[PDB]
From a paper:
We pursued crystallization trials with the BC-module (residue range AA90-276) of mouse [name], noting that the flexible, Ca2+ free N-terminal domain presented higher B-factors in two independent crystal structures, and was not part of its binding site. We presented the 82-GLQNLREEIKQLGREVRAQLKAIEPQKE-109 [name]-derived peptide as a C-terminal tag on [name] for [name] binding. Diffracting crystals were obtained with the structure of the protein complex determined at 2.65 Å resolution (for statistics and model parameters see SI Appendix). The electron density map allowed the modeling of a 22 AA (Q84-E105) and a 24 AA (G82-E105) segment of the 28 AA-long [name] peptide stretch in the respective copies of the asymmetric unit. Peptide residues Q84, N85, and R87 formed hydrogen bonds with the side chain of Arg198, and the backbone atoms of Ala192, Met190, Phe188, and Leu186 from [name]. The segment, which formed hydrophobic interactions included contact residues L86, I90, L93, G94, V97, and L101 with Van der Waals distances in the range of 3.5 to 4.0 Å to the residues building the groove.
[name] is one such EF-hand Ca2+-sensor expressed exclusively by endocrine cells of the pancreas, adrenal medulla, pituitary, gut, stomach, and subsets of neurons in the nervous system. [name] is built by three domains (denoted here as A, B and C), each comprising a pair of EF-hand motifs. Here, we identify [name] as a molecular switch between [name], a protein facilitating the movement of reserve vesicles toward the active zone, and [name]-25, a core member of the vesicle fusion complex.
Residue numbers in the entry:
A (entry chain C): 91 to 188, 191 to 273
B (entry chain A): 2 to 64, 68 to 230, 234 to 255
The structure:
Amino acid sequence: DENFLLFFRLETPLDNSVEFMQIWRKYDADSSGFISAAELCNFLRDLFLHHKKNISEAELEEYTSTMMKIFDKNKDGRLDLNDLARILALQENFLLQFDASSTEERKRDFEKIFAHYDVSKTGALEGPEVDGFVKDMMELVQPSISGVDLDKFREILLRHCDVNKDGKIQKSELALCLGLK
Amino acid sequence: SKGEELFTGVVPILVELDGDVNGHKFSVSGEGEGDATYGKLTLKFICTTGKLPVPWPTLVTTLVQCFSRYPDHMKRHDFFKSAMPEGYVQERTIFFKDDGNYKTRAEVKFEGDTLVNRIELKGIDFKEDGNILGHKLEYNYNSHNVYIMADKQKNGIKVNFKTRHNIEDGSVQLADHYQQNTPIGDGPVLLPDNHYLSTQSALSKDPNEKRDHMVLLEFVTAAGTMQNLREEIKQLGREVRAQLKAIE
Ligand SMILES: C[As](C)(=O)[O-]
Ligand SMILES: [Ca+2]
Ligand SMILES: [Ca+2]
Ligand SMILES: [Ca+2]
Ligand SMILES: [Ca+2]
């Protein structure tokens, strides 16, 4: 058939926004809010060598160029958040899984939600755990977020729910600012 | 509920107003239909006595709030449809700041399959070249909320809101509405918790009508009442949204 397209077979979909934000935070090296061609090639170079398939850098440039042509919606040379969510095959917003008005059913759902975004099992949301939650939460109230806004968004969210002012969102803090027991 | 049952589909509407404002007598006949499922009202009004002595926007409020869309978790608060088909009395005093005042009494009831609004209006103390009798108001309407409170005393509801009517000047004429609603035919009605009605009105003209007239499109919806976790996640998101838009 065709060279390339290997990457889609290599791509297993992502269930969680936290892991998407880790990849996004990792390859936006200049913190510009978008993914350049140079940065995308860095991402593809690492993705391939973890699978130990081997690629001369000539066709790494070629496949990077092919991926920009396909997923750069407005041909500005920059992939934004949703341009990369397509690449990494991020699935439907996790928060859409949820009528429960009881006080104990809401605590049950809050546990499932906080468990989803606390990948680190520390009991507090930190780093790309905040971003993943912020992305899924903001896309319930407005069209979609820009990569430049998420540094603004995290700052705002912490000033809302960081009661002890330590820089991370403990379980109790997120429960309290959602209005829960 | 049977009252709530009467507004399932499209209901034809008839409106008849007979008014007395600073001596000038006039009458208005209104035809149209209402769709409560969407909180929609299309109506055409015609002055049968020739030229109208007051501007049309000053009559929109008086010229049938039973066609408001009540979100189904607010149906308990739908008072205007709980008084049907026997209907209710709507009494208003409308104070125009630095001008006169209308006092209206109206019966809104079902006469067959047609919803009917018959109104007597008395306007007094107006100023002959205030914005009302001088016809200085702009032909449009401004959306606003209509605040509803229960009145256990009179087995009805007290309602209060201010409308603002633009003038050519860029000025604004303030009208202070005070109104009470009481069942005509006695019976069990629903007295609601404090809430408001979001209403917007568009005013047009039929190109083929030479009589003084007003074509009216209206949308009314109930809100202001309150749950699950995602809605708490939503209002946390709306508050985050609000904060980001400030620092910009
Ligand atoms: C940005 As899209 C929802 O078309 O992948
Ligand atoms: Ca970048
Ligand atoms: Ca782009
Ligand atoms: Ca954690
Ligand atoms: Ca904290």
